[PDB]
Amino acid sequence: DDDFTAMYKVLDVVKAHKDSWPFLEPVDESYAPNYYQIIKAPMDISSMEKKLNGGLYCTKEEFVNDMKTMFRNCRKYNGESSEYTKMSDNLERCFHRAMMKHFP
């Protein structure tokens, strides 16, 4: 399996996880005051999908970095005890499991 197919499958697993929904689309600032002032490099699953479909990823590392940035953004904006941070931790473990399966 080539890296890009592997990436597609990983994104599929992450999307399928019960806690993916806050991460599926770009953040709507109407429900996240000052989000784009606080977060330097926003990232979401649909954007990763589109980069992958548009062949904009050069390497596995770029893909992984977008995923990790997405989770860091969440933790930074929402705080440790937040519902969204709980979800980000579950989803990051989902990501890790998926990576081990599809990048063995």
* Residue 19 contacts residue 90 (beta carbons within 8 Å): yes
User: In this chain, which stretch among 23-31, 49-57, 63-71, 87-95 interacts with Na ion, using CB under 5 A?
Assistant: 87-95
Nearest to Na ion of 65, 78 (CB atom) = 78
User: In this chain, which stretch among 4-12, 27-35, 54-62, 88-96 interacts with Na ion, using CB under 5 A?
Assistant: 88-96
Q: Please, which of residues 19-78 interact with Na ion by CB under 5 A? A: 39-40, 78
* Residue 45 contacts residue 20 (beta carbons within 8 Å): yes
Residue 96 CA to residue 30 CA, distance in Å, equals 31
* Residue 24 contacts residue 69 (beta carbons within 8 Å): no
Interaction of residue 93 with Na ion, rule CB under 5 A: yes
Residues that bind Na ion (CB under 5 A): 39-40, 78-79, 82, 93-94
